[PDB]
Chain length 142, copies 4
Amino acid sequence: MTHIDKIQALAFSIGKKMQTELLEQMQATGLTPPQFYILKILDHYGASRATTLAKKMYVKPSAITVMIDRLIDQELVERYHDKDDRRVVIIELTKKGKARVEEAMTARNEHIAKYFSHLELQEREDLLRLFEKLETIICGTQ
Amino acid sequence: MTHIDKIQALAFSIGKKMQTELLEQMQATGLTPPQFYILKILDHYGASRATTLAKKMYVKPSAITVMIDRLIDQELVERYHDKDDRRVVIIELTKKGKARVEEAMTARNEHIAKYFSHLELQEREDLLRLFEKLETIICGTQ
Amino acid sequence: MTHIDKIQALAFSIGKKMQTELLEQMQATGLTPPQFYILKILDHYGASRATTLAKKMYVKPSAITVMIDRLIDQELVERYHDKDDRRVVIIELTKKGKARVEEAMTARNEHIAKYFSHLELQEREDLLRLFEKLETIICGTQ
Amino acid sequence: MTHIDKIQALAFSIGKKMQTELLEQMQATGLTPPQFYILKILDHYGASRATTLAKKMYVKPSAITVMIDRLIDQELVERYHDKDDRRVVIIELTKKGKARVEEAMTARNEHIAKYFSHLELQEREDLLRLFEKLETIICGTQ
Ligand SMILES: CCCCCCCCCCCC(=O)O
Ligand SMILES: CCCCCCCCCCCC(=O)O
Ligand SMILES: CCCCCCCCCCCC(=O)O
Ligand SMILES: CCCCCCCCCCCC(=O)O
Ligand SMILES: c1ccc2cnccc2c1
Ligand SMILES: c1ccc2cnccc2c1
Ligand SMILES: c1ccc2cnccc2c1
Ligand SMILES: c1ccc2cnccc2c1
Ligand code: NI
Ligand code: NI
Ligand code: NI
Ligand code: NI
């Protein structure tokens, strides 16, 4: 219980500001932040299992399924099943998806970059691990 | 730059869930999280300077002014100027405000309490200090 | 299909502005717009059946149940069952609820009042009936 | 004043549902509803003045400027000045923008289409003109 009400007070105020900036980013890139991060993973590691994407995002497989369905609508990734093992679902960046992720890189919201440049690398790592833990608690993941 | 896109991906997903829970809390208590925290400060320390409230919330005086104007509309606090030093602005809980903060205590969103009970006290302290730093960066405070 | 994309474009832009004003109103009154309207109904007609509230709001009984649970948390209404016919659920304004609705009256967002004062009474009636129809379509009500 | 609180109650409930569906649409198409409608105008009439886009959206020129800046980030339109009259600002769909608007057509949110198919064409026209009037009142346009 301790620190909860103060954390929520700060999260509300920060979040109210961050939401405006994220709507700008969505307007400038055509992606929500989780969609963008998905594309970055696939850009980095190439074609990957949908279950690995879920693990990297700290969400359930079923949650990644919806995300991927939306990225398919935008034609940014392709989903397929391994030819012989149809249980293995592979997600892959399309040519469009690769161009979108690079464009999104350059069109990122600059106010958000400014705020986080005032946090040490080590402080960003701390926040990220706390968020990953919170996501795990919320989603019932590992 | 490192960790920024992953942090935003997680913040978006967590925030989407947290927003639903905060709307419930607003419906159940009649307060946003910063308004509730303000009332808790005034319940704890009694009548306090508006500038001290601003410091405790990591926001500018001008930001606290709007918050307090809204709490005055709900009749939960009273604002007055010291009788001889009219530069000193004091904020005080009303009888209504005291009843509201106690009621809000009991009617807090239980999903949020559940999530944060899975974080160590020390992890809550870490998140809180990171949020206070982020708020300071965003608001241009000390 | 015709007019749908234009309507959504306008609804998005209007809604983005209206959301800021509604958050102010929530801060100033401690009520969301449906909670406020519920209290106005109970102020006008006195104690009423929960099913009648649902009909007046164009929502399912189950939807009004959640709303009323939240108004009970804020202690603004009381729910009870008729003494002999326990199927009849009656909702009633408390002394607190009556004071809140009057206070909310005076603390209403003035920007919203300004916009709607530029619509004829007959245009407000048209919008209201279109919204009631849309609500009925969405909620599966009568 | 009459009908205002009821309209806001309904707008809040409808809007809460519509927001979820619009976030899906944004995920599925990479466009907010005003961005999509802009692209539809440019698809229909070809290259058009930025001032004409503003008129068609019932917003100020300055508002369309921001929208267009975001569509430029996504590379969906091109802005240029007439070669001899540099006061005349022309907006034009790119090859990417044309493909995006067609894709967006097919990936539109089906729940929204379902709701509006239950309104007569004449009722959609009424809502649209009321929204255009409301937008005009809010933006200070003609
Ligand atoms: C009825 C549609 C609701 C529209 C939701 C728009 C979301 C706006 C987010 C607030 C940030 C801003 O106002 O820029
Ligand atoms: C046009 C009015 C817009 C209404 C904003 C309501 C905010 C809803 C927040 C989303 C959470 C939920 O759907 O429960
Ligand atoms: C993580 C918590 C999210 C906070 C949601 C706040 C809603 C803000 C609505 C946008 C209007 C405004 O910015 O004034
Ligand atoms: C801190 C970032 C805030 C994230 C805003 C996400 C908007 C969610 C809109 C509510 C609809 C839904 O929950 O599906
Ligand atoms: C609190 C609330 C929202 C956030 C959004 N992005 C990064 C950090 C955040 C902290
Ligand atoms: C990220 C986004 C929103 C939050 C809201 N409350 C607590 C923690 C959070 C982390
Ligand atoms: C469109 C979108 C949101 C609204 C909110 N309140 C009144 C009218 C509206 C029209
Ligand atoms: C009220 C609130 C939001 C809306 C969004 N889209 C269409 C109609 C609407 C009416
Ligand atoms: Ni296949
Ligand atoms: Ni005084
Ligand atoms: Ni009883
Ligand atoms: Ni040029």
